[PDB]
Design a protein around this ligand. Structure first.
Ligand SMILES: C[n+]1cn([C@@H]2O[C@H](COP(=O)(O)OP(=O)(O)OP(=O)(O)O)[C@@H](O)[C@H]2O)c2nc(N)[nH]c(=O)c21
Lengths: 190, 19
């Protein structure tokens, strides 16, 4: 009496993930503006994905964040404070043409562990829906892990399939401007 | 290094989007 798993068992993910939503209130503290749900199988990922609004359908000023269970989508978290992110800056036209598919590919890269061993350095990704231009970013745990960071950025850019000549940069969180712009630099580029 | 990581290719994941 041994049922065949492939017939009734859900496809497990390497990690359990949590989806977060951010609603700008302008007044409230950034943190006060929430967890949606968590999942750790392929089937559960789609069930959640299929019933939530596409990023392009969200009001400007909102964010979707998918992070490994236990890691809050903020700079202050133990797994992000020494880290950084690969930033994808989209123009206004790309909201229609690339925002949604780019975000889905990002999700597939995360849950599918597409960066091989370097996937352990991945914390999560966030998509910012903004009137001036949408942004997508994959956050990693340590900005000093060049090998991991550069390989992730390379595979990520490849997966998105955007023109190879376009360069993207990685910025550490501890380096974000604290003045009025103070030139927010990149530590790496690919 | 070392560890049986569960890896899924995009095609595998997309084929089960509706399943
Ligand atoms: C990701 N994040 C964003 N914020 C706050 O959200 C603001 C907006 O940061 P943003 O990443 O949401 O980009 P946005 O396009 O809204 O704005 P801009 O690029 O500066 O024009 C920050 O300046 C912070 O005040 C954050 N504040 C805290 N404490 N922690 C975080 O992890 C964090």
């Amino acid at each position: 009496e041994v049922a065949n798993p492939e017939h009734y068992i859900k496809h497990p993910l390497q990690n359990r993930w949590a989806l977060w939503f951010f609603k700008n209130d302008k007044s409230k503290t950034w943190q006060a503006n929430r967890l949606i749900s968590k999942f750790d199988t392929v089937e559960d990922f789609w069930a959640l994905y299929n019933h939530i609004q596409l990023s392009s359908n969200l009001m400007p000023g909102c964010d979707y964040s998918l992070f490994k269970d236990g890691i809050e989508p903020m700079w202050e978290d133990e797994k992000n404070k020494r880290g950084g992110r690969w930033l994808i800056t989209l123009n206004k036209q790309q909201r229609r043409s690339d925002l949604d598919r780019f975000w889905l590919e990002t999700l597939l890269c995360l849950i599918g562990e597409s960066f091989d061993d370097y996937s352990d350095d991945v914390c999560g990704a966030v998509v910012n829906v903004r009137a001036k231009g949408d942004k997508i970013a994959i956050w990693t745990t340590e900005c000093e892990n060049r090998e991991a960071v550069t390989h992730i950025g390379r595979v990520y850019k490849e997966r998105l399939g955007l023109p190879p000549k376009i360069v993207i940069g990685y910025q550490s969180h501890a380096d974000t401007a604290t003045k009025s712009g103070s030139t927010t630099k990149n530590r790496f580029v690919v | 290094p070392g560890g049986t990581r569960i890896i899924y290719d995009r095609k595998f994941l997309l084929d089960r989007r509706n399943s």
